[PDB]
Amino acid sequence: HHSSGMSWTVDILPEGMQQQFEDTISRDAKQQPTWDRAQAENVRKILESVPPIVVAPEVLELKQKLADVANGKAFLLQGGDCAETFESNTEPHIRANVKTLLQMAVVLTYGASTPVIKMARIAGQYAKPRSSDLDGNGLPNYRGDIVNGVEATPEARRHDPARMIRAYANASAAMNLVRALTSSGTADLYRLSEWNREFVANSPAGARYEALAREIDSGLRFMEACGVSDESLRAADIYCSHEALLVDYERSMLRLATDEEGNEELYDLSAHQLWIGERTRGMDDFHVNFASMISNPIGIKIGPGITPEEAVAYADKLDPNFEPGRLTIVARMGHDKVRSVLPGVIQAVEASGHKVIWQSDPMHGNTFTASNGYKTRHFDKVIDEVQGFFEVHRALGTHPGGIHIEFTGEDVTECLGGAEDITDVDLPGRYESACDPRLNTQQSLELAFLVAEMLRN
Amino acid sequence: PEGMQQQFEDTISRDAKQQPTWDRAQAENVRKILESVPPIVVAPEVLELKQKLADVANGKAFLLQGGDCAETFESNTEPHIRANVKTLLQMAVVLTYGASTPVIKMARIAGQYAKPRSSDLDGNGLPNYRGDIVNGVEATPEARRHDPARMIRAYANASAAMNLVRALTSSGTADLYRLSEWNREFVANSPAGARYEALAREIDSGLRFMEACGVSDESLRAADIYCSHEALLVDYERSMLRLATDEEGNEELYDLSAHQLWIGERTRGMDDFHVNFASMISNPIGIKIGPGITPEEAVAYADKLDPNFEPGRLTIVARMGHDKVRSVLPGVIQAVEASGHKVIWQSDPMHGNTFTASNGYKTRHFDKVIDEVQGFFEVHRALGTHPGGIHIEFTGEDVTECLGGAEDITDVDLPGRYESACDPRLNTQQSLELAFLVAEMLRN
Amino acid sequence: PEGMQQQFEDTISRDAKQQPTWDRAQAENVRKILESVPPIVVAPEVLELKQKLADVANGKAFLLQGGDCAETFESNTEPHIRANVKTLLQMAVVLTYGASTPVIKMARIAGQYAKPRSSDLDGNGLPNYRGDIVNGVEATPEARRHDPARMIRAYANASAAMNLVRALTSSGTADLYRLSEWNREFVANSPAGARYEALAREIDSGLRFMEACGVSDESLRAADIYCSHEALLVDYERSMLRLATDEEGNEELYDLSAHQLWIGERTRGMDDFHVNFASMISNPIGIKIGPGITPEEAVAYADKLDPNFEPGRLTIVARMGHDKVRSVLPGVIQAVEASGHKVIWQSDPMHGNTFTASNGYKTRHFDKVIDEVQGFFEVHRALGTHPGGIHIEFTGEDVTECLGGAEDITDVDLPGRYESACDPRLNTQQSLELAFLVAEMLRN
Amino acid sequence: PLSDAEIQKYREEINRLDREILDAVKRRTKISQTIGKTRMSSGGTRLVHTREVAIINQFREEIGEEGPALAGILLRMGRGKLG
Numbered sequence A: 001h002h003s004s005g006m007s008w009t010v011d012i013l014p015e016g017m018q019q020q021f022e023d024t025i026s027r028d029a030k031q032q033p034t035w036d037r038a039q040a041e042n043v044r045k046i047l048e049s050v051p052p053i054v055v056a057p058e059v060l061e062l063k064q065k066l067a068d069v070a071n072g073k074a075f076l077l078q079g080g081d082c083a084e085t086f087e088s089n090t091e092p093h094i095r096a097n098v099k100t101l102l103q104m105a106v107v108l109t110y111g112a113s114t115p116v117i118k119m120a121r122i123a124g125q126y127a128k129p130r131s132s133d134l135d136g137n138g139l140p141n142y143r144g145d146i147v148n149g150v151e152a153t154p155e156a157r158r159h160d161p162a163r164m165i166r167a168y169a170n171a172s173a174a175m176n177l178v179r180a181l182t183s184s185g186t187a188d189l190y191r192l193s194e195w196n197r198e199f200v201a202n203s204p205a206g207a208r209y210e211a212l213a214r215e216i217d218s219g220l221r222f223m224e225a226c227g228v229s230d231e232s233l234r235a236a237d238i239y240c241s242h243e244a245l246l247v248d249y250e251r252s253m254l255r256l257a258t259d260e261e262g263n264e265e266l267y268d269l270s271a272h273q274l275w276i277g278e279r280t281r282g283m284d285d286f287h288v289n290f291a292s293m294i295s296n297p298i299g300i301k302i303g304p305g306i307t308p309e310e311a312v313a314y315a316d317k318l319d320p321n322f323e324p325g326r327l328t329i330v331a332r333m334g335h336d337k338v339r340s341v342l343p344g345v346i347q348a349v350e351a352s353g354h355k356v357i358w359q360s361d362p363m364h365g366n367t368f369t370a371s372n373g374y375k376t377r378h379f380d381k382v383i384d385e386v387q388g389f390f391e392v393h394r395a396l397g398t399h400p401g402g403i404h405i406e407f408t409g410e411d412v413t414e415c416l417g418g419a420e421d422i423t424d425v426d427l428p429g430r431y432e433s434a435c436d437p438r439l440n441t442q443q444s445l446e447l448a449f450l451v452a453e454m455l456r457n
Numbered sequence B, C: 001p002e003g004m005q006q007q008f009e010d011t012i013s014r015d016a017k018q019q020p021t022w023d024r025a026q027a028e029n030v031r032k033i034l035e036s037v038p039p040i041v042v043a044p045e046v047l048e049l050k051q052k053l054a055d056v057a058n059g060k061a062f063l064l065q066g067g068d069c070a071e072t073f074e075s076n077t078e079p080h081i082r083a084n085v086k087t088l089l090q091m092a093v094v095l096t097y098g099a100s101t102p103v104i105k106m107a108r109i110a111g112q113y114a115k116p117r118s119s120d121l122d123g124n125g126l127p128n129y130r131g132d133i134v135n136g137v138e139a140t141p142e143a144r145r146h147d148p149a150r151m152i153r154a155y156a157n158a159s160a161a162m163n164l165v166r167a168l169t170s171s172g173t174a175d176l177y178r179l180s181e182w183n184r185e186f187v188a189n190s191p192a193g194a195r196y197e198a199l200a201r202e203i204d205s206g207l208r209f210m211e212a213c214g215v216s217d218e219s220l221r222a223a224d225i226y227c228s229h230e231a232l233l234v235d236y237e238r239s240m241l242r243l244a245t246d247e248e249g250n251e252e253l254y255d256l257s258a259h260q261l262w263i264g265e266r267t268r269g270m271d272d273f274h275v276n277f278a279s280m281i282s283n284p285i286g287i288k289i290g291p292g293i294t295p296e297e298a299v300a301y302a303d304k305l306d307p308n309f310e311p312g313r314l315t316i317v318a319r320m321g322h323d324k325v326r327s328v329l330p331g332v333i334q335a336v337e338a339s340g341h342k343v344i345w346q347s348d349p350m351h352g353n354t355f356t357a358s359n360g361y362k363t364r365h366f367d368k369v370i371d372e373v374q375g376f377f378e379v380h381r382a383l384g385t386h387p388g389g390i391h392i393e394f395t396g397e398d399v400t401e402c403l404g405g406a407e408d409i410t411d412v413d414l415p416g417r418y419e420s421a422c423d424p425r426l427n428t429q430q431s432l433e434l435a436f437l438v439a440e441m442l443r444n
Numbered sequence D: 001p002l003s004d005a006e007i008q009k010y011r012e013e014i015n016r017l018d019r020e021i022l023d024a025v026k027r028r029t030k031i032s033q034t035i036g037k038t039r040m041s042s043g044g045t046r047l048v049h050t051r052e053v054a055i056i057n058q059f060r061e062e063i064g065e066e067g068p069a070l071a072g073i074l075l076r077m078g079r080g081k082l083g
């Protein structure tokens, strides 16, 4: 009864988090806009008291799913627009991308024989990095809709802190609709498979997919034949993500969250998952150090100059407590470098005891500028990077964790190849991307079938 | 003893073929004993089967029925019952994937103790074996004597077998994932495993898709197996009659010796006992028809046996021979469909394809068994009607009774391990092989 | 059969009390027959029961065991079995609501055919009725002869009973909402319905709350009933031993005449057959302890019957009489808990409270049956230990065997419908009342 | 009957054809792999999608329903299973 006495009396910014923050705020930050510090601060104070885009418990749930991906028990599908725009942040467009991702995910689930975690580039992807600050004419470059406008005028191209507020509005409108669609029938497994059969039936390359597709259909009819109810099959979770880029916006969305135990964590609640770009990943700079002090799952893009030593060093900075799926390493190497560079990256990282998600981004290392002056990517080069990624993983015995692709559910003419045989002269028909060339609906579905076979092997 | 007594009086006053010649007074006392014993099945189970069989007849499900040709008391053991149950369940998984519909699983078990014969003819031990519910296998006068007390023994064996079927199916034997692992072992070990490889892998990708989709379920752990047998013996079947009242207050007469009961090719006289008995019980029932049947005889059976036009109530079991199914069945099907009845069309590819080999063993060629089921699917696809089910005789033992299949059983192999107390059965391998081939028929 | 064989020879080399004197060569023929028959239960079931019984002993579940004092072949009928099954399930739903835990439901059934007698013979030299597995109720020289063939009859009857129990519990008799409607018509019809009104209304509100929360579940349509009986007769029990091999590859020896077996108060010598047989088998075991037990004697049983310290493995069944339960049990509990075994503590409030009334009939007063369970709960609450379950003899028929209850049965009433072939049973009403009161005890 | 002699002679023809198919499938496979080794030694892709689809649709025009499946076997033997 010493515990009887105690129980009656006991009845009747924090710590070094502020250290790490000021250290992080001190650091150099690549790819930032030049705008008034006073204006920027006033906007940050507004955004500090608004509702976040996601809540912390959603982020703790994603973390358990990403751990399953890392441990070999699930696959990650990430993708969407290269860059969202406020003009294109519309119901029909968001719906087109959500459907497309959900459609790709059913095929991939069947081929992976594992759950697929569905992560959209959405509800925040409004900042893009640029090589120079000015155009050929001394006109400030478009830096995404959170900084300036697309229109090639000096008014439009001015860097405007208030666009952070427009971006937050558009992002929450967008996440709102993503949540509504996925809970009200758009994420229905059977409706989704009806849309995939139409894809196969109407494709000029349908004969390439019909057999895998008949197989999936027999798998679905089987489920129902075995007396399996509607239950989990009527809805699904889509997670938002974007490049953590604009310092003022990402700091303004930092939130404290306290969990089941009473444990207190710092989250960037502008998205479930955030990533660090190729051009913003200096180990001594803001972005890498910011991701290292937020609790959100994190991605990092690595190009073909990456060395294994550098890979290990990031893994140590970003996953310091050895948490599976905390860190996703996003290999974007080019189709001709992937087989050469990645093996040694994976080996050093695996040997160092980190269990990261290994993800292929077959888009950003396979971009070229065609005769007619259009930035484009060839379907075959995109497929071959992914295919090379899988070959490396099969050779090493490691897990091909996921893909990250830029696509839209719109019938655009942005990337060459696929079943429609899109060539140089087709590109100006319907090129709508505000940044990089995206796979169209047809190319996205083709890729899901092909990556399904990669998984099946 | 309701105002339906007039129907009953009419039934028992009818001639019945294929009965024993035993002491009727003693038989009557065995009936009175069995009138008070617990039934083999309860009426709510029969009502549940009847909704499932409506699903089959309406094109939304498929009926798998099978097991020993003749059960025996000697063979009514845990290992033997478990083997047949496993085999039936394994077959059902593959058929379910092929049909894209649920499979209703019906076992020839817990009652299949009576068999028909030409006419109890022999030289020295004159009385032929009529099944363990009448007499014994040994060819002596003492064993072959028709003994009413075997109805009590049959019931005791039926009880124990059904108890065990129920225990196996609720405790893990009918788990979908365990069953698929056994199918994987079949494919891996068959000399014809490469024939089945592709479909087997597909089934597995299907199962793994269920799990990947978040589906755990209680439906996947367990399964229903219904019992059935030929209602042949008058004294036993009438003694297992019971009245049952529904949730709606309807009093109904069931023969609760089994979920489902069928009438043989040799006992289906319209004016005789068996057809009339089947007419007044509420269990779903089936009727065997051979190659001699005419479309008008099929319609007359349907009128008498499905008088309230209840889909699934009647199952018409074509046992026509591989070489006659294609020419005889189309007309039968066309006529019954037009008369407005919705029966389950079921193929029994065994009883029309039996012959005796040069070494004297009754056998069946696997190809002729397959070809009959094949032909039956051909007739159905031509007419746009529903291939409803199969009825096959098999066992989960490595017996040498039917010719063919992957292991290439020939006449010289037959005497090695022939263990049927009656017709030759598919062995475990041939059974699982046929399951795959019928899956393909179902997929077309 | 290597480590086991040593231990089996030791078990069968020991005295067994309460056996019949019959021709041993006959008994041995009967054992060889029963060694080939399908068991009453399969090993995966017993493994499942043991997980559930582990939950009971660890304080996360409650054991409800009960049924006839003594089954007879005469009484082994659909109505009688359904009646007891219904009552057991109805009791279980009320107890589940009171406990806020699952109730494991265990019927005295499918083998409670043997009873211990004090004198082998009576004062006029006639052998006593030892149960339908040994001899007949009819008091003649021929009917009282010890007949080993009755072992086969017991097996056949047990098979049938257990077959039916499984059929009823999978086909709607165990549906939660149907059971609650029967409870509702009990409360509405009892002379003491007003005693139970509030609690019944609370349960119904709870049921309708699940439905309102959108709980659509097959969990609520069916339930598992495990069989049990006193493992008394050496020959029947050893002939139902079976080796079962596990999922991970272990060989265990089970007695598969029941899921659970217990050792009676008159057969629990440490040096004797029954305790040593119970030590050998891997079924969960119960042991009846009476008022003369010592804490040391109780710990010696726990060491021997639960050698591997497996929670739920042993159930200690206190049958002490209401007047002694508060004195004797506390010390027994402390000793066994301190010895590190986690047993199920169960009350048998029946066998310690029997007496012969003025008119000659044996009976029990409802109040004394209640007071023992009440006292058992008081002892548990004081010590901070878990009341694990109850063991009660009852039938779902309107008998006049026990005194008291809402209907105030007295001496004069006992001759009306006294039907038990051994001890006085609670009738339907008394059983349903007892469930409500024990639910309040569970609620405190 | 007499039909057994005819069937046995038709089967020996099928055997000769199955040998031809197989020998030619083998040879085709060798050549498809060389093209892949030559294209990949030059920094090209393992697969060429429009070339696969063309062969696949070509086979369907030729033999119907099974054409894509037949083609699929040749493509898989020739450039390997994907992944």
Ligand SMILES: O=C(O)[C@@H]1C[C@]2(C(=O)O)C=C[C@@H](O)[C@@H](C2)O1
Binding pocket: D032, D033, D035, D036, D046, D047, D048, D049, D051, D052, D055, D074, D075, D078, D079
């Ligand atoms: O480029 C090619 O022509 C070769 C041959 C190939 C085939 O096997 O037919 C056809 C297309 C390509 O994917 C592969 C396989 O390379």
Ligand SMILES: N[C@@H](Cc1c[nH]c2ccccc12)C(=O)O
Binding pocket: A102, A103, A105, A106, A109, A115, A116, A187, A188, A189, A192, A232, A233, A234, A235, A236, A237, B212, B213, B214
């Ligand atoms: N909810 C399950 C199954 C499912 C429903 N809708 C989906 C859409 C795509 C992929 C899977 C699904 C899952 O997401 O895994």
Ligand SMILES: N[C@@H](Cc1c[nH]c2ccccc12)C(=O)O
Binding pocket: A225, A226, A227, B089, B090, B092, B093, B096, B102, B103, B174, B175, B176, B179, B219, B220, B221, B222, B223, B224
């Ligand atoms: N109970 C489900 C699924 C299932 C479990 N075990 C089976 C065995 C065979 C076929 C199906 C099953 C059904 O019968 O539909």
Ligand SMILES: [Mn+2]
Binding pocket: A082, A083, A406, A435, A436
């Ligand atoms: Mn991009």
Ligand SMILES: [Mn+2]
Binding pocket: B069, B070, B393, B422, B423
């Ligand atoms: Mn037969």
Ligand SMILES: [Mn+2]
Binding pocket: C069, C070, C351, C393, C422, C423
């Ligand atoms: Mn008793």
